[PDB]
């Protein structure tokens, strides 16, 4: 036994940190190049702004790649992994669009290139720049996304926005809450369209959640729901309280500041914890 700080945890406790990921499904048609739904971005931005005021210096916003990101991966030459470099430019564009919009409504939103801050070592992302912590300590809102990351052999890999919360794990003090907004209400069990949402998944033994999953579409290059589950199990096994739930641009999100047991009764999600 190595000693560590005892962190009080539970459905009664308020999060110390929010990592909110917004799926591309919610503001982009993957099929349509350069699709960004500015109305969706605008409306979501307003809701993210309120969260960012409360979680000042205690939140990151993570954007999916949409048409920009999936397109970069679709269109690269798999025979030279370096052609994935275009992915970093593509996901920068999406971070830019979020950050611009947020700054227009008074949020100190700053896009950061994950590829400039993180590399892979034995498959595990490694935060290698102190700048993310400084930005948060200045009270700003980092806008992040997935990226093309170098490994220790110099090979580029496509690293989904869904996995970005993993990079926060050794950095974030106290209770991390990770919320992945998507186009489904959570992990649906008993049907490749629907039956019922699985309300709780135990990250120590999530075999039933994995049993529920179905395929990625043709348009999807980063593994859809399986990649989400893998990332959120990873985060939950390191103490995070994680959620898959439905995004909606005008939906109020202030309940994401609140302890889970105090959430409104209408809110549906899959919660992943240990």
**Residues binding a second copy (CB under 8 A):** 82-83, 85-86, 88-89, 92, 96, 99-100, 103, 108-113, 115-119, 128-131, 134-135, 137-140, 150, 153-154
Name which of ligand ADP, a second copy, none residue 113 binds, using a CB cut-off of 5 to 8 Å depending on partner kind. Answer: a second copy
Per-residue exposure over 143-178, b if at least 16 CB sit within 10 Å of its own CB, e if not: bbbbbbbbeeeeebbbbbbbbbbbbbbeebeebbbb
- Breaks in the chain listed by the residue before each, with C–N > 2.5 Å: none
Name which of ligand ADP, a second copy, none residue 257 binds, using a CB cut-off of 5 to 8 Å depending on partner kind. Answer: none
Nearer to ligand ADP, 176 or 209 (CB): 209
Name which of a second copy, ligand ADP, none residue 117 binds, using a CB cut-off of 5 to 8 Å depending on partner kind. Answer: a second copy
Selected from 173, 214, 250, 254, the binder of ligand ADP by CB under 6 A is 214
51-80 positions binding ligand ADP, by CB under 6 A: 64
Establish whether 201 is an annotated binding residue: no
Q: Characterize the bridge pairing of strands 176-182 and 241-246.
A: parallel
Told to check if 220 binds ligand ADP by CB under 6 A, we report yes
Establish whether 183 is an annotated binding residue: yes
Give the single-character DSSP code of 45: H
Establish whether 155 is an annotated binding residue: no
Structure tokens at 182: 């998507």
Per the CB < 8 A criterion, the answer to whether 271 and 201 are in contact is: yes
Told to check if 19 binds ligand ADP by CB under 6 A, we report no
Would you call 128 helix, strand, or coil by DSSP?
A: coil
Establish whether 24 is an annotated binding residue: yes
Give burial (CB, 10 Å; 0-12/13-18/19+) of 12.
Answer: exposed
Unique residue bearing structure tokens 């699709």: 35
Establish whether 106 is an annotated binding residue: no
Distance (Å, whole) CA 89 – CA 85? 7
Establish whether 11 is an annotated binding residue: no
Nearer to ligand ADP, 64 or 125 (CB): 64
Q: Which residues are annotated as a binding site for substrate?
A: 65, 70, 161
| Bind-site residues | 21-25, 30, 65-66, 70, 161, 182-183, 188, 212, 214, 216, 224, 228
């Amino acid at each position: 036994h190595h000693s560590s700080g005892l962190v009080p945890r539970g459905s009664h406790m308020t999060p110390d940190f929010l990592a909110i990921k917004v799926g591309g499904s919610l503001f982009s048609r993957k099929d349509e190049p350069g699709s960004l739904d500015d109305d969706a971005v605008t409306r979501f931005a307003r809701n993210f702004a309120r969260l960012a005021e409360t979680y000042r210096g205690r939140m990151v916003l993570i954007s999916g790649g949409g048409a920009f990101g999936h397109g970069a991966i679709r269109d690269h030459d798999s025979t030279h992994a370096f052609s994935l470099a275009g992915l970093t430019e593509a996901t920068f564009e999406v971070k830019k669009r979020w950050a611009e919009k947020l700054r227009g409504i008074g949020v100190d939103a700053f896009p950061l290139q994950l590829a400039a801050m993180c590399t892979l070592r034995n498959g595990i992302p490694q935060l290698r720049s102190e700048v993310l912590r400084d930005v948060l300590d200045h009270g700003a809102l980092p806008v992040l996304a997935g990226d093309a990351l170098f490994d220790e052999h110099g090979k580029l890999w496509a690293f989904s926005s869904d996995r970005v919360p993993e990079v926060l794990l050794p950095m974030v003090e106290g209770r991390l809450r990770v919320v992945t907004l998507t186009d489904v209400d959570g992990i649906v069990t008993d049907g490749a369209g629907g039956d019922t949402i699985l309300p709780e998944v135990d990250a120590r033994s999530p075999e039933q959640a994995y049993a529920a999953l179905w395929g990625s579409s043709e348009w999807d290059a980063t593994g859809a729901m399986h990649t989400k589950l893998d990332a959120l199990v990873t985060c939950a096994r390191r103490g995070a309280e994680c959620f898959i739930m439905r995004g909606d641009p005008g939906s109020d999100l202030e309940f994401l500041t609140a302890p889970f047991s105090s959430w409104p009764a209408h809110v549906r999600s899959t919660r992943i914890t240990t």
